[PDB]
Design a protein around this ligand. Structure first.
Ligand SMILES: Nc1ncnc2c1ncn2[C@H]1C[C@H](O)[C@@H](COP(=O)(O)CP(=O)(O)OP(=O)(O)O)O1
Ligand SMILES: [Mn+2]
Ligand SMILES: [Mn+2]
Ligand SMILES: [Mn+2]
Ligand SMILES: [Mn+2]
Ligand SMILES: [Mn+2]
Ligand SMILES: [Mn+2]
Ligand code: NA
Ligand code: NA
Length: 326
DNA sequence: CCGACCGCGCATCAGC
DNA sequence: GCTGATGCGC
DNA sequence: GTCGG
């Protein structure tokens, strides 16, 4: 964090463009510029120094020059102050409330936790849960507690069928001291490309995790994806652990490695990879690795037995999960 | 100087 | 009632 | 907002 002040600035700018301006590409743009600087090995002494890097253009060098000089950004003070921009910004921190919804509420005077509290009957199931665990959801998860969760998940999965291979991923697999949530990749022999579609492969496990009382709430549940709420059990009469977010995705067996790659990220890493795999002549997606023909056609899915295998195809130094945090 | 930058699985709901 | 349109988190 | 075309 040699350039920490700059990348924090870039980040707030991102959220702004994404939550208020509803311009997902400026968001990405700032998001990208930050990751590039947050990986530069020197301490940025000017905006021009930063302008050398790919992802940092004129406006960001200009902003960097102010931040360096002044010590703050005028454009951000304005944002920070403006009530509306400031309010939409807040709402989006509730799970289930994105730009559009937050912008709507604010336009109807609802702009704070208390307001959502008053107008509760004007929120979908997901937004209610969101508000209900507002504080809980913004808390990071100690890597230790993850382990205890990685134990209850992996375990309970076995109890449904010993053939299930539940692999915890995300920044956790990347070996992180804490994680925003718990992402679980799930597979089973009876489910691959072909499959004939096995009904309730995910249902049974979701169900079982609710049996022991580990999964307390459902934000969404389909045939291959579940977004919900879980909670580590408490000793006796201590204090309930914070309620945590859990995502579980059932992927076809012969796509595991490719999916385990995607779901481990980092997200920006994935932006990076699904980008250099094109200059090499391929096209990665969370499900497969495909070659690009003449005009660029989805060639058949190449065989994959390791993450390393995916790197080989695109000729990139194999990087361990821990070094993919970008 | 202009246009691409992943798009997908799920829930909800305007319009009929 | 059904469903195309859209919003949401990742 | 950026950078490649
Ligand atoms: N916009 C995006 N484009 C492409 N891939 C994306 C993505 N957002 C998320 N991903 C992929 C890679 C993440 O590692 C993986 C997990 O997505 P995630 O949002 O659960 C966050 P994680 O990386 O686990 O850290 P943490 O904040 O939760 O502790 O999902
Ligand atoms: Mn150097
Ligand atoms: Mn009020
Ligand atoms: Mn995660
Ligand atoms: Mn997740
Ligand atoms: Mn333009
Ligand atoms: Mn439909
Ligand atoms: Na540059
Ligand atoms: Na949100």
């Amino acid at each position: 964090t040699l350039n920490g002040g700059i990348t924090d600035m870039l980040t707030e700018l991102a959220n702004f463009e994404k939550n208020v301006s509803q311009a997902i590409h400026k968001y990405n743009a700032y998001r990208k510029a930050a990751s590039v600087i947050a990986k530069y090995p020197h301490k940025i002494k000017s905006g021009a120094e930063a302008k050398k890097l790919p992802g940092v253009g004129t406006k960001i060098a200009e902003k960097i020059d102010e931040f360096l000089a002044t010590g703050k950004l005028r454009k951000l003070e304005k944002i920070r102050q403006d009530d509306t921009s400031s309010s939409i910004n807040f709402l989006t921190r509730v799970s289930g409330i994105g730009p559009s919804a937050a912008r709507k509420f604010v336009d109807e005077g609802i702009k704070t936790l208390e307001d959502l509290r008053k107008n509760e009957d004007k929120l979908n199931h997901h937004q209610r849960i969101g508000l209900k665990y507002f504080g809980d959801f913004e808390k990071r998860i100690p890597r230790e507690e993850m382990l205890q969760m990685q134990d209850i998940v992996l375990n309970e999965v076995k109890k449904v069928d010993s053939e299930y291979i539940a692999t915890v991923c995300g920044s956790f697999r990347r070996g992180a001291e804490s994680s925003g949530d718990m992402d679980v990749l799930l597979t089973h022999p009876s489910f691959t490309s072909e499959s004939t579609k096995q009904p309730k492969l995910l249902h049974q496990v979701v169900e079982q995790l609710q049996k022991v009382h580990f999964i307390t709430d459902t934000l969404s549940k389909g045939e291959t994806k579940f977004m919900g709420v879980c909670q580590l059990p408490s000793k006796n009469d201590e204090k309930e652990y914070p309620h945590r977010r859990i995502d579980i995705r059932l992927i076809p067996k012969d796509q595991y490695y490719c999916g385990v790659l995607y779901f481990t990220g980092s997200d920006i890493f994935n932006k990076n990879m699904r980008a250099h795999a094109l200059e090499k002549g391929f096209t990665i997606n969370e499900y497969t690795i495909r070659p690009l023909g003449v005009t660029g056609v989805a060639g058949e899915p190449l065989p994959v037995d390791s993450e390393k295998d995916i790197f080989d195809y695109i000729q990139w130094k194999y990087r361990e999960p821990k070094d993919r945090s970008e």
